[PDB]
Amino acid sequence: MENITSGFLGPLLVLQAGFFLLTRILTIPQSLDSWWTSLNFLGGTTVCLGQNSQSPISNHSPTSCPPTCPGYRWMCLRRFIIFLFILLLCLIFLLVLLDYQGMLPVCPLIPGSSTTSTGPCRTCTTPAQGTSMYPSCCCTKPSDGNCTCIPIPSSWAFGKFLWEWASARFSWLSLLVPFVQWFVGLSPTVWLSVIWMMWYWGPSLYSILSPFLPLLPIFFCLWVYI
Amino acid sequence: MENITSGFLGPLLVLQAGFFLLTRILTIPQSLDSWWTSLNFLGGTTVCLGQNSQSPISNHSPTSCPPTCPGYRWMCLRRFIIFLFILLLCLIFLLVLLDYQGMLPVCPLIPGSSTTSTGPCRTCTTPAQGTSMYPSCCCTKPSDGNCTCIPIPSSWAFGKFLWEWASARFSWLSLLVPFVQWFVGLSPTVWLSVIWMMWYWGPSLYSILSPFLPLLPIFFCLWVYI
């Protein structure tokens, strides 16, 4: 009866979904390379001499050229460059996922004195070596036995942890922090306006600022000496 | 007579180095895109057809033609995109070196009775659903429980961390991962041969692979039934 239909239809859906989803994710790289054509067709009148008259003569446009004839031995090269990049984009999406799910670990170890525990300290840490840096918290201190450090946060990931790390390793990031805060204070009335003014207005000032850009190192050195 | 000499010599080094760094940073963006003109050389003629003869009659062509005349607006957005990409590349190199510092902590969890040193269990018993990634293990349990848990162990900070979730949501092809280990032995004197073999014979087998690729879902379903 209709019972066998339940089992049979699953195979049909699996086959259809697999075919479509395998064709599309494998045709996307060539689609992106033909999206660069935005450059390639920016000049216009795209006709590849790679479709040279070696085996056949018909000028096979300039995107796929001849499938094999004359110049066709570089579609593999552009693919080779591109599909592995889509993989790196997927890896970045994965990294964002760990930050958002809070599931990903962010066990931190930095010098501090924040206390949140039950009947804690009165022995604490007395490490007079290795500066103020902390090592894996099995028992960080050379002689710590009852040690307990700090658990991973439900907020921002090692993104924030590396914010702290870079602030420790750099100095100018702290001065950029006011600029970062002011950029964070950008509503759609502010966020959109910057992008709108970005187009067809910045290149003109760029040529003039190029002489100005060449003269910022002297100001930096002047303040460094001061 | 050397303190002023040292201060001046340092200014000369700063002037040389900062300017060289700025020039190199400028050259890279209009560097990778020209490389990409492998498309043009795979296409054939390399010429800016968009060289509008209105202001500049210069048929000098060969791309990067006018900084200002004709179309120049895309010539800059693309430099910005490829600049952010190479920025992504240098970031991933940074994550590689974070993987190598040894102090990048994974702070992972797994069920086992092992210990890095003398660890008294004292009837360590408190289990929970999802033993992997359990509570903070700051003795966070119905009682303290005399708990000792994992520090950030010294290992590939990246692979040993990522593989955990990889296997958690994977091991469909962990057998292929053993095959990956079985094949990873071709790095010296065989890697170049494999790369050359891929170069010479890459396209011919694609037609056969494509015809067999549709049959692969059938074999996958057969495995799903076997």
CB contact under 8 A, A105 and B106: yes
For B38, phi then psi, to 5°, come to -55, -35
Q: Please identify which residue in the block is written with the tokens 């020039």.
A: B23
CB contact under 8 A, A200 and B73: yes
The residue of chain A with its CA nearest to that of B162 is: A104
Provide the residue type at B174 as one letter.
S
Residues in chain B with CB shorter than 8 Å from the CB of A135 are 103, 151
The residue of chain B with its CA nearest to that of A222 is: B11
The residue of chain A with its CA nearest to that of B15 is: A217
Q: To the nearest whole angstrom, how far is the Cα of A152 from the nearest Cα of chain B?
A: 8
Provide the residue type at A2 as one letter.
E
Look at the alpha carbons of B138, B143, B144, B146 in this order and tell me if their dihedral is positive or negative.
Answer: negative
A with B: how many residue pairs have Cβ under 8 Å apart? 106
For residue A182, how far is the Cα from the chain centroid?
A: 23
CB contact under 8 A, A50 and B67: no
Residues in chain A with CB shorter than 8 Å from the CB of B202 are 76
Cα–Cα distance for residue pair A24/A35, rounded to 1 Å: 15
Tokens of A55: 């085996």
| Contact present, B123 and A106 (Cβ < 8 Å) | no
Residues 6+ apart with CB under 8 A from B187: none
| Contact present, B88 and B77 (Cβ < 8 Å) | no
By Cβ distance, the residue of B7, B74, B138 closest to A151 is B138
| Contact present, B225 and A10 (Cβ < 8 Å) | no
CB contact under 8 A, A135 and B103: yes
> Which helix (H) or strand (E) element contains residue A59?
none
The resolution in angstroms reads 3.7
| Contact present, B74 and A38 (Cβ < 8 Å) | yes
By Cβ distance, the residue of B49, B138, B139 closest to A43 is B49
Residues 6+ apart with CB under 8 A from A177: none
Residues in chain B with CB shorter than 8 Å from the CB of A217 are 14-15, 18-19, 22
Q: Where are the alpha helices (DSSP H) in chain A?
A: 3-43, 75-101, 158-169, 172-184, 188-198, 202-212, 216-225
What's the 3-state SS for chain B? CCHHHHHHHHHHHHHHHHHHHHHHHHHCHHHHHHHCCHHHHHHCCCCCCCCCCCCCCCCCCCCCCCCCCCCCCHHHHHHHHHHHHHHHHHHHHHHHHHHHCCCCCCCCCCCCCCCCCCCCCCCCCCCCCCCCCCCCCCCCCCCCCCCCCCCCCCCCCCHHHHHHHHHHCCCCCCCHHHHHHHHHHHHHHHHHHHHHHHHHHCCHHHHHHHHHCCHHHHHHHHHHHC
Rounded to 5°, angle at Cα B168 from B167 and B171: 40
**What is residue A215's DSSP assignment?**
G
**Taking chain A, what is the end-to-end CA distance rounded to the nearest angstrom?**
90
Residue of B4, B16, B30, B42 best to disrupt the A interface, most CBs of A under 10 A: B42
| b/e map B42-63, b = 16+ CB within 10 Å | bbbeeebbbbeeeeeeeeeeeb
By Cβ distance, the residue of A50, A138, A221 closest to B116 is A138
Reduced to 3 states, what is the DSSP secondary structure of residue A9? Answer: helix
The residue of chain A with its CA nearest to that of B51 is: A43
> Which helix (H) or strand (E) element contains residue A118?
none
CB contact under 8 A, B67 and A11: no
